Amino acid sequence: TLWYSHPRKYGQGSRCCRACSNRHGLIRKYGLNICRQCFREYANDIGFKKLD
Amino acid sequence: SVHRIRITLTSRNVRSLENVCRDLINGAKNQNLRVKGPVRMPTKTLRITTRKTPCGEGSKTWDRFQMRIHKRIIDLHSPSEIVKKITSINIEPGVEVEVTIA
Amino acid sequence: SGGGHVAQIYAIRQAISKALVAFYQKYVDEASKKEIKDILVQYDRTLLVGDPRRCEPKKFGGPGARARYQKSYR
Amino acid sequence: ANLPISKKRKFVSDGIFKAELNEFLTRELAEDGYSGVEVRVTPSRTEIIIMATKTQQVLGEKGRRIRELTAMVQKRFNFETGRIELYAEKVAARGLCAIAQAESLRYKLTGGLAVRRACYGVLRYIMESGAKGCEVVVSGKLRGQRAKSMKFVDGLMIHSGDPCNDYVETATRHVLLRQGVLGIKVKVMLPYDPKNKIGPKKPLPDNVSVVEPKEEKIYETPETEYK
Amino acid sequence: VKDIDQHAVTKAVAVFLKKTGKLKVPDQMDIVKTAKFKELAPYDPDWFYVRCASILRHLYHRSPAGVGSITKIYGGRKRNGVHPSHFCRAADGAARKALQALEGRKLSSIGQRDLDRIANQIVFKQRDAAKQ
RNA sequence: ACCAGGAGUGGAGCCUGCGGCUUAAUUUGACUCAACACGGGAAAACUUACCAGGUCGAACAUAAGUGUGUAAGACAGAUUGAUAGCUCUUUCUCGAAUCUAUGGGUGGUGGUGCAUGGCCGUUCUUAGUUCGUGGAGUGAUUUGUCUGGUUAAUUCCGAUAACGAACGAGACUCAAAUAUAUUAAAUAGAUAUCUUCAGGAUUAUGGUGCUGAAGCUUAUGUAUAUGUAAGUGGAGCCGUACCUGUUGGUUUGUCCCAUUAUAAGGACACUAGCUUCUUAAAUGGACAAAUUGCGUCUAGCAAUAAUGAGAUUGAGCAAUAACAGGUCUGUGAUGCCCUUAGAUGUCCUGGGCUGCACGCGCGCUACAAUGAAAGUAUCAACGUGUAUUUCCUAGACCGAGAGGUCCGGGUAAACCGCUGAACCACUUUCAUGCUUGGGAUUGUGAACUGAAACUGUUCACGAUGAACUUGGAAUUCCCAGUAAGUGUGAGUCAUUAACUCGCAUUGAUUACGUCCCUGCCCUUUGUACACACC
To answer: What is the full DSSP assignment across chain D?
Structure first.
């Protein structure tokens, strides 16, 4: 209610980090939301074998 | 009167995508379900690249990652009274059947 | 389709060359197939040398495939 | 439930789904030795086959731990109560999967720096369960202040190629040391062919086996009766 | 129409409707720069409605073609804003009212055999003109 | 790493990396190679860790009011940035978690990468590591791992002094060339013909042709077109088929039928559209006795044999011992230390990270005649796109524009879209004149995104035209669909790309080596070499 600003619906803030709650390091715009320093540990089991 | 139920099938593993033409389509063409053969689709490849390294300081290249999921479509010129049993058998891990009702 | 303002005109040559070679194989005459080949193959201007030279995947550190921008203070 | 979601976003939402189920299950069933999950999304029911070792405690009183499993995700993902069925299956060849063996090393390293009786015995049973190659390392502080990295190899670890894209099985374990920290990384190399091996892959990467040439009766006399 | 390329033919047709009173002159025609990239106004107006010859191939092969699908892909050789160049929409405006200059749905209903065959008779006459 | 070169940058403009400067604070990490368009770092605030004002409360037994209100909230005027009953002049109030001084735990983008883990980079465009048997030797450790041949290769041969050693490299993983020869289409359709959209006389003309045809105007009805006459004018008119073109279906074709209409059932071509193509799901695929005065019989370059194919062919994966490399600010990985109602935490209001006499690096904008202009011709592809959040867009409409409105499509080989991309190519306009080249600067309104813009949100219009004509010493990358030009998409996104990840088009000179120089890989080799010439 009081003392809670930021109508978040524009930009990054605050639609951030469905994997680590770390707002600065997100990769989002496919549907991943993995906070890609939390991707190499979390690459399996979500597909994504390397091929070249 | 007669229905044309066109059913998409997809999976990631091509071997299961090769498994389904071994068992499903011949259990229906034995009784004239009008499969019209394996309707393979182009796949949906996706490549994501980023910094592979937390604190990526040095020779600062990237890591590539790939994904391939392939589709193969089975349409049939047969009504609804025949096609409920093929939805029960055979079922495979990671295959997706989509039959429209309403 | 495809090609461009140069390379699309190229593929006419392979089409117009082999159009005679298959109509002469199965429909007209063996020596008619033979008389259209020996005139070509003297130097042939790659009318049938379909080199599969294609665009190569790109790499990192460059603006091109086999390029790399550099001088990180040598 | 049913969404108008794109199929490429349908497929990745499946991958992010199973990326969370293993999290608390490693957090909870590390003592029972959880290894694996197989998920199939069937019509009218979603079947999830969890692979765990100590199956006599994954159940609880009148299915107390069983109904604990269904209590997890039907409020986490808020899906329909009735489609979700979870079952923890006893793994076959517990010394062969060995990822729970790495997990129990945390339960083995609480004996006060027993590299001889326990960590040297880690490499015993995986050879007693018959691997051609295996690996453990210890990376962290041992015997004092400065950290020391020691290797424990026994076998044939190739580090490269599609057999190494298929034969190995990774396991990274951060166990909290009394002083500060310990990371544990184990690797295994498995005999994919011989025993039953219906679905590891049962391949052969390069090993060309050549059969007996079957020497022949070169004369081949008639001895012909006319029946 | 499937005769010789309309480098000269598009010059020809732009005067022919200009001869028959169907000019239908624009209002800011000395002001317009046909896009937010250009730095000089054009010399005249006849080059504007030359794209009836395009829709003799674009209604023929592409589609019954709207205004937005036309002008964005139309007229691109563009050097945009200086650091660095991009690609833009060419900013049609008043040429979406060029159907009044000609008088599931179709854009020009008279250019099927009534209007375009006369232009095809012109290139057939230009075949006789270029015959010597 | 050169040479033979090429394009460059280092000059100019500008944008950012960072120092320096300064500031309330201009948060900060990282110093060769391997910090320097990196922490995806393209930040108004948020992020943010920075600075300046504020702000929350969080355990426990103890314990003492008693429930004669321990509290908790607003008006009111101060305080405010707003209302913050945060405070409070003054008012009623659900009052009970008994709101405790006390255990202490909680939290942190606090400290430390000289506490580590994990991860990554280099050591790695090379060719090396290391174990069970022995004979070397008092031991260190050597032998194995070679004198040679050859290899990208510790790659094999052969000497052969463990071999049966084991990895590494090979090998396997991916990517368009490859018989549709086999089943395969809401991709695409080849086609075939049905057609319809029909010029021409390319055709044959039948009616017709100077008799007024074709064409031309006026009048008004109908709601201006058309009708007609007059007007009008002096050769053509109208119809067919051939030619060349829209369209619609040709799915087991036609006519059947059930059906509202597909199929067969009924017959015919007996195929009145089939699978070339895109798509593979597969085997195929230079699959190498490939011919060659055989080299230490062993791997005689030879291009040459094929005729999709003289590798279709590029990355990914990468050891051993390690280094005080990188990070505790990726993290509810985390030791230790720091703090805890007066917070570093946390949420609000702000600023700032963008501040500028200065150093620098990474790139784009040009320095114009292989052009700047105008049009015209007319070409891709990876991809891309909205369900619980407003994406992709088309279609009409308005507007110098920017953009605005209306009806749509598309959760997607399906709609955007067959995305009908730029540079080129084609007539011109310019006369080389810091010039119409080059667009920094700076006003101005016009936009628009977002609650909100001001070394800036970007975009419009019409003004403004600097610097700079090839860039000192220097120094970058690179041998084919490559360099390089020239673009699109993706990524960060409400709006902001000049970078970043691949896509695609256009398409060179020159090398087809050498061991000088900076390099690097282990064989003999002197040494005082050691923390290894720093």
So the answer is: ------HHHHHHHHHHHHHHHHHHHHHHTTTTTEEEEEEEEETTEEEEEEEES-TTSSS-TTSHHHHHHHHHHHHHS---TTTEEEEEEEPS-HHHH-HHHHHHHHHHGGGTS-IIIIIHHHHHHHHHTT-SEEEEEEEEE-SSSSEEEEEEEES----SHHHHTTS---EEEEE--SSS-EEEEEEEE---SSSS-SSS----SS-----------SS--------
Q: How many CB atoms lie within 10 A of CB E34?
A: 19
* CA–CA distance, D101 with D105 (Å, rounded to integer): 6
DSSP for B12-25? S-HHHHHHHHHHTT
Q: Which of D96, D100, D112 shows the shortest CA–CA distance to D31?
A: D100
Q: Residue B11 forms beta bridges with which residues?
A: B70
- Quick one: which H or E segment has residue B5? strand B5-11
A16 labeled binding residue? no
Residues of chain B with Cβ-Cβ distance to A27 below 8 Å are 48, 50
Contacts B–D by Cβ distance under 8 A? 17
> Side chain identity at C58, as an amino acid letter?
K
- Compute the distance between CA of residue E132 and CA of residue E125 in angstroms, rounded to an integer: 12
- Per the structure block, which two tokens stand in for B28? 């229906």
Measured between alpha carbons, how far is B78 from D71 in angstroms, rounded to an integer?
42
How many CB atoms are located within 10 Å of the residue D52 CB? 21
Strand duo B62-65 + D45-52: pairing: unpaired
**Resolution for this experimental structure (Å):** 4.9
Compute the half-sphere exposure of residue D182: CA atoms within 13 Å on the CB side of its CA. 19
CA distance D16 to A48: 12
DSSP state, residue E60: I
Per CB-CB distance under 8 Å, the chain D contacts of B44 are: 7-8, 11
- Contact indicator for D96, D128 with CB cutoff of 8 Å: no
CB pairs under 8 A between A and B: 28
Query: Are the C-beta atoms of D138 and D174 separated by less than 8 Å?
Result: no
Report the largest interatomic distance among the alpha carbons of chain C, rounded to a whole angstrom: 70
Nearest CA in chain B to A26: B50
Instruction: Measuring from the CA of residue E62 to each C1' atom, give the nucleotide at the shortest distance.
Output: F420
CA distance E132 to E130: 5
- How would you class D84 by CB atoms within 10 Å of its CB: exposed for 0-12, middle for 13-18, buried for 19 or more? middle
Rounded Cα–Cα distance for residues B24 and B28 (Å): 7
Q: What is the CA angle D215-D219-D225, rounded to 5?
A: 115
> For residue B75, how many other CB atoms are within 10 A of its CB?
15
Tell me the HSE value of C29 on the side-chain side, using a 13 A CA sphere.
6
